[PDB]
Paper text:
GDAP1, a 358-amino-acid mitochondrial outer membrane (MOM) protein regulating the mitochondrial network, is highly expressed in neurons and less in Schwann cells. GDAP1 contains two domains similar to the N- and C-terminal domains of glutathione (GSH) S-transferases (GST) (GST-N and GST-C, respectively), a hydrophobic domain (HD), and a transmembrane domain (TMD). GDAP1 functions in regulating the mitochondrial network by inducing fragmentation of mitochondria without inducing apoptosis. Although the sequence identity is only ∼20%, the GDAP1 core domain shares a fold similar to canonical GST enzymes.
We determined the crystal structure of the complete human GDAP1 core domain, which shows a novel mode of dimerization within the glutathione S-transferase (GST) family. The long GDAP1-specific insertion forms an extended helix and a flexible loop. Notably, the GDAP1-specific insertion (α-loop) was present in all constructs, in contrast to a recently reported mouse GDAP1 structure. The results indicate that GDAP1 forms a unique type of homodimer mediated by a hydrophobic surface and a disulfide bridge. The main differences constitute a missing α helix between β2 and β3 and the unique helices α5 and α6 with the connecting α5-α6 loop. Variations in these regions prevent GDAP1 from forming canonical GST dimers and interacting with typical GST substrates. Contrary to predictions, we show that GDAP1 lacks helix α2. On the other hand, the catalytic Tyr9 residue of GSTA1-1 is conserved as Tyr29 in GDAP1, but Tyr29 points in another direction and makes central contacts at the GDAP1 dimer interface. A CMT-related mutation cluster of GDAP1 mainly localizes on helices α3 and α6, and less on helices α7, α8, and their connecting loops. The main cluster contains 27 residues that interact closely with each other in the crystal structure, including salt bridges, hydrogen bonds, and van der Waals interactions, forming a network of interactions.
Residue numbers in the entry:
A (entry chain A): 23 to 72, 77 to 160, 186 to 302
B (entry chain B): 23 to 72, 77 to 162, 201 to 226, 236 to 268, 270 to 302
The structure:
């Protein structure tokens, strides 16, 4: 067969979505984790949060959204699951809507703003010493201003994250209303696991890692979202691909 | 050792710049031509003239302009030739200009203006049955071609002020962009239209790189439609 080759960083947010798609679609892929256990400065992966590429025959595709679009387009065997409904379907506008809504979130800024200013996280899974590493009065006020602006920005996107999850919460509430409690529960947009679901699951898993989870769900807040998360953690594909991607004890 | 991997199409314009940079820097690279001789629609490589990627240890770099930048920044061993002067040197601001101006040429438009509207081509190396196949505007084509006349006008004058190469004594990244660019223009048939009675020092510049050891090794026969 025409080999599928993927170069990626095991712990990068974009890599996680690609590898999960490959697993949802049951595709055979020669996956190369180019990341090292120890860096040139002898630092583990959780201290280095800062694009993947697919080679399939004559095609070379970079960036995760493009790779996944390529996979959904080219692997059309009847046994291969589709993660998107047909373009002429009732459901396509809704799946593409939430997929874009979640793929638009500034995850890089959430992680950068977690290492810096960890006082806005709760139960962050990154060690606290990651924050410590990362006359002249002109500079004393210079750096105070950059901190003031960096926080004003971080707080702003965290408020924008809440409003995105509010829609997801409301959407998941519509599914809970439409589904008997005794029976198979649907996913975000329907009975089928879609690309909107991989973007949501991987996003939530990372917000958990950054300590931005208790702020947004749990202890009565967004119960449908909490249920959705504890469920995808049990999903066989998710656990195999991402089961221990938040475990800083594993290299 | 840390391996240097490149996935590329041999006959891609951008890939040619990358592979030439690698050879000009004397870097051991495992290069994978992922292109096939015949497509599923049974077309040779000169029909499908419609991004490369470099893997180096923990690094993955895609677009060609970025691959070349990564190579110039990373392999700083004294035995590795530099294709770019220091960023605070007197000579950097000019090399970057010609580099950006050459890298800004619409090579995709030229190629499709060669297949289509072959009347504006002279000694096009693409067989004529590509024009018949692809047909199943000349206004915009003549425009970008005349824009090219103006860009080449700048290159001709810089060559008078000079053996050395385009910007200075050493072979630089402005040279690969110029060399690979001209070489493609010849393939497309736009070589006589722009230089025997016109642009003499450029004709000497183009004829000189063709004899260059490294250029001939990597691009000696990228214009030969008989080779896959």
């Amino acid at each position: 067969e025409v080999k599928l080759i993927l170069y990626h960083w095991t712990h990068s947010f974009s890599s996680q979505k690609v590898r999960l798609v490959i697993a949802e679609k049951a595709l055979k892929c020669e996956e190369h984790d180019v990341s090292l256990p120890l860096s040139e400065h002898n630092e583990p992966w959780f201290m280095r949060l800062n694009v993947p590429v697919l080679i399939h025959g004559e095609n070379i595709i970079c960036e995760a959204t493009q790779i996944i679009d390529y996979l959904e387009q080219t692997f059309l065997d009847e046994r291969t699951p589709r993660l998107m409904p047909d373009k002429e379907s009732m459901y396509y506008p809704r799946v593409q809507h939430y997929r874009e809504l979640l793929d638009s979130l500034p995850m890089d800024a959430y992680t950068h703003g977690c290492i810096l200013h960890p006082e806005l996280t709760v139960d962050s899974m990154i060690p606290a010493y990651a924050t410590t590493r990362i006359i002249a009065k002109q500079k004393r006020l210079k750096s105070k201003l950059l901190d003031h602006d960096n926080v004003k920005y971080l707080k702003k996107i965290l408020d924008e994250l809440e409003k995105v999850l509010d829609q997801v919460e409301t959407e998941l509430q519509r599914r809970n209303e439409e589904t008997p409690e005794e029976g198979q529960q649907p996913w975000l947009c329907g009975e089928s696991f879609t690309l909107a679901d991989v973007s949501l699951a991987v996003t939530l898993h990372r917000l958990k890692f950054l300590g931005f989870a208790r702020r947004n769900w749990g202890n009565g807040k967004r119960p449908n979202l909490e249920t959705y998360y504890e469920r995808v953690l049990k999903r066989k594909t998710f656990n195999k691909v991402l089961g221990h991607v938040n475990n800083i004890l594993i290299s």
